[PDB]
């Protein structure tokens, strides 16, 4: 294809023809990038031989006219069955639109037109305008919660990694202190056969759960299996376990080896049940269908593959015969090793159940939100999701971010993008299942990179991010479906919207009931004048920091910059000097603002370069966001413990032990501490004085 033909095909496929570059100038995408992203997509060539009477899907907002346009000509008879079962019938002529019956309920309906034999179906979705909000926020209350990295939690009972047992126990302590929720890192299924690949942000699947979180103590068949107690009783077992627990860093390998060994024995007992339990399990499997089966089959197969060779990190590294789920050899494996598949099914049932148990406690204590999950932006190229539904993803591209003024190289996130053409061709089925998997048993959901609904930066496989382009998604339809599912689950939505958001979309997100995300470190203008607490928008969540950033102490001590220098991340000493100065001005403006908006004692110093971190300053930084007009406050425990050390350093691969740094204290210890209890009672009061 020559330029101008291609230019049109690209445009019609939803590929934006340009972007604002790192010098602020608009820049055209190359013809090569266009060629390669078209080839990456899954479009069907239209024959226009008798194009369809109505589209395969239509989305409407409730309380409005619903003009449905009908192509062709001659009389068509239409049947509209609601989700509830209600039937509407009529006739219509092609080339003339007709309005759907008014006052249709929200949900998922089916319109069917008929002429002679020929039937056409259209999924008709009726959505509310806004996502759901708890009564507490409708009544303008200001709530707070703990935002934790689940794996970092220490306790007297766990096996060397925070898990659902600890989550359940922490819900209680948080709730007794006026806490409204606990927020989580993404708990998406990862790789038990490759436990050391621990980033929650390259998951196997975004529908299933990370099984390392199972609380083995809570598993009845662990206790009943003689074989398992013999194993638990070994001195090498109790020594291995003690060391895993005592370590300051999560040993994923060891903990995984311990849990799988124990659970494999527990399974031998469970597999013989003929009771409520086995009934509940088998019904779970049935209701969840093939997506679950392929997840379990993946993990079962992966377990074997690492034995043959430990470099088989994912499916693209497996012998090619195992890269197709319908091959004779995958079929053979599944018949023969059904028990193994069954085992991994059971693990998902345990994780599901235990997460439900946590959710049930939070509602017992009447927490307005209770549990607050995080949905990563995509899946890894070599996990279970792309393995069994390859059409849905475009493996010849990676999602990332473009070059901009802040980062002139841009980023590559290494995630194959979901294909917008398949999303729509399947009537949004994959977007619905994704929300249904991530909204259940919880009262809030965080959408990583909520801009993903307008567009993503697609990079042709194995190229630098400058060779990318923005590829668009049906934002309106997705924002409607988001609202609909949000309301159906009674699960409010927080849209992570750091970085650039076109003004247009800020508006849509706000009126769609999505909550904004605000980080203290970033909420200052170019002059480091910090935003006033009362100017934080009502419809937002306020946090001091995130897992990608320094803790309050790390920030204040420039520990990120210093440690960064130590690990080779800042080779350019000029750029580094800039970042120090930039930090010191940031610190000064922040200190000015703490004093100004009444977060500190009178005696506290006013010059920031002379100050080190103290309990008073630690408290002040948190009061600042607690006094904010943001409806929700997220507090890191790392900051209650006054921890200096980060949990992830973006840009590192091996240089830092990312996703491993444990909290410096256990739950029991933390919640028995005077300072912690005083801090939280102060902060909880500050939320109450904020109206």
From Swiss-Prot:
<dbReference type="GO" id="GO:0004134">
    <property type="term" value="F:4-alpha-glucanotransferase activity"/>
</dbReference>
<dbReference type="InterPro" id="IPR003385">
    <property type="entry name" value="Glyco_hydro_77"/>
</dbReference>
<dbReference type="GO" id="GO:0005829">
    <property type="term" value="C:cytosol"/>
</dbReference>
<dbReference type="Pfam" id="PF02446">
    <property type="entry name" value="Glyco_hydro_77"/>
</dbReference>
<dbReference type="GO" id="GO:0005978">
    <property type="term" value="P:glycogen biosynthetic process"/>
</dbReference>
<keyword id="KW-0328">Glycosyltransferase</keyword>
<keyword id="KW-0963">Cytoplasm</keyword>
<protein>
    <recommendedName>
        <fullName>4-alpha-glucanotransferase</fullName>
        <ecNumber>2.4.1.25</ecNumber>
    </recommendedName>
</protein>
<dbReference type="Pfam" id="PF21226">
    <property type="entry name" value="MalQ_N"/>
</dbReference>
<keyword id="KW-0119">Carbohydrate metabolism</keyword>
<dbReference type="InterPro" id="IPR017853">
    <property type="entry name" value="Glycoside_hydrolase_SF"/>
</dbReference>
<keyword id="KW-0808">Transferase</keyword>
<dbReference type="GO" id="GO:0000025">
    <property type="term" value="P:maltose catabolic process"/>
</dbReference>
<dbReference type="GO" id="GO:0005980">
    <property type="term" value="P:glycogen catabolic process"/>
</dbReference>
<comment type="similarity">
    <text>Belongs to the disproportionating enzyme family.</text>
</comment>
<dbReference type="InterPro" id="IPR048458">
    <property type="entry name" value="MalQ_N"/>
</dbReference>
């Amino acid at each position: 294809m020559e330029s101008k033909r291609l230019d049109n095909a690209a445009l019609a496929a939803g590929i934006s023809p340009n972007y604002i570059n790192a010098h602020g100038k608009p820049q055209s995408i190359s013809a090569e990038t266009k060629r390669r992203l078209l080839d990456a997509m899954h479009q069907r060539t239209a024959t226009k031989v008798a194009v369809t009477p109505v589209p395969n899907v239509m989305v409407y907002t409730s309380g409005k006219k619903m003009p449905m346009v009908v192509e062709g000509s001659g009389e068509y008879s239409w049947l509209l069955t609601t989700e509830e079962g209600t039937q509407y019938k009529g006739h219509v002529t092609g080339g003339k639109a007709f309005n759907l019956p008014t006052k249709l309920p929200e949900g998922y309906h089916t319109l069917t037109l008929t002429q002679d034999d020929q039937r056409a179906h259209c999924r008709v979705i009726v959505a509310p305008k806004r996502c759901y909000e708890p009564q507490a926020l409708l009544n303008k209350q200001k709530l707070w919660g703990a935002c934790v990295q689940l794996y970092t939690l220490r306790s007297e009972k766990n096996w060397g990694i925070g898990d659902f047992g600890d989550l359940k126990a922490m819900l209680v302590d948080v709730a007794k202190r006026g806490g409204s929720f606990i927020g989580l890192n993404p708990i998406h299924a990862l790789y038990p056969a490759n436990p050391e690949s621990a980033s929650p942000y390259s998951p196997s699947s975004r529908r299933w759960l990370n099984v390392i979180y199972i609380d083995v103590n809570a598993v009845e068949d662990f206790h009943l299996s003689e074989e398992a107690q013999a194993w638990w009783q070994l001195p090498t077992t109790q020594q291995t376990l003690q060391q895993a627990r005592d370590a300051d860093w999560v040993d994923y390998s060891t903990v995984t080896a311990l849990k799988m060994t124990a659970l494999r024995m527990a399974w031998k007992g469970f597999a013989q049940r003929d009771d409520e339990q086995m009934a509940a399990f088998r019904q779970f499997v049935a209701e969840q269908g093939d997506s679950l089966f392929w997840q379990a089959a993946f993990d079962a197969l992966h377990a074997q593959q690492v034995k043959e060779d430990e470099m088989r990190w994912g499916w693209p590294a497996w012998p090619e015969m195992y890269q197709n789920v319908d091959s004779p050899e995958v079929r053979q494996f599944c018949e023969e090793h059904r028990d193994d598949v069954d085992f991994y099914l059971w693990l998902q049932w345990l994780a599901y159940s235990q997460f439900a148990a946590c959710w049930e406690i939070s509602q017992g204590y009447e927490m307005p939100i209770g549990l607050y999950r995080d949905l990563a932006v995509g899946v890894a190229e070599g996990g279970a999701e792309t393995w069994c539904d390859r059409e849905l993803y475009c493996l010849k591209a990676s999602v990332g971010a473009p070059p901009d003024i802040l980062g002139p190289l841009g980023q590559n996130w290494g995630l194959p993008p979901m294909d917008p053409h398949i999303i729509t061709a399947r009537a949004y089925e994959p977007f619905i299942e994704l929300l249904r998997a991530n909204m259940q048993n919880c009262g809030a959901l965080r959408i990583d990179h909520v801009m993903s609904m307008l567009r993503l930066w697609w990079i042709p496989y194995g190229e630098t991010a400058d060779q990318g382009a923005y590829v668009h998604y049906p934002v309106d339809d997705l924002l409607s479906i988001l609202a609909l599912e949000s309301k159906r689950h009674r699960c409010m939505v927080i849209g992570e919207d750091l970085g650039t958001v076109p003004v247009e979309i800020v508006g849509k997100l706000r009126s769609s009931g999505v909550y904004s995300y605000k980080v203290l470190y970033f909420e200052n203008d170019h002059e480091k004048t910090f935003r006033a607490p009362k100017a934080y928008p009502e419809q937002s969540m306020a946090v001091a920091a995130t897992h990608d950033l320094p803790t309050l102490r790390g920030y204040w001590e420039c520990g990120d910059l210093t440690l960064g220098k130590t690990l080779g991340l800042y080779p350019d000493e000029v750029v580094l000097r800039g970042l120090y100065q930039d930090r010191e001005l940031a610190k000064q403006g922040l200190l000015d603002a703490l004093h100004k908006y009444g977060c500190l004692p009178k005696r506290a110093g006013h010059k920031a370069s002379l100050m080190s971190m103290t309990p008073t300053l630690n408290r002040g930084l948190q009061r600042y966001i607690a006094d904010s007009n943001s409806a929700l406050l997220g507090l890191q425990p790392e900051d209650w413990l006054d921890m200096a050390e980060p949990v992830n350093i973006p840009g590192t691969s091996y240089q830092y032990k990312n996703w491993r740094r444990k909290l410096s204290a256990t739950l029991e210890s933390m919640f028995a501490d005077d300072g912690v209890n005083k801090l939280l009672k102060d902060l909880d009061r500050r939320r109450r004085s904020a109206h």
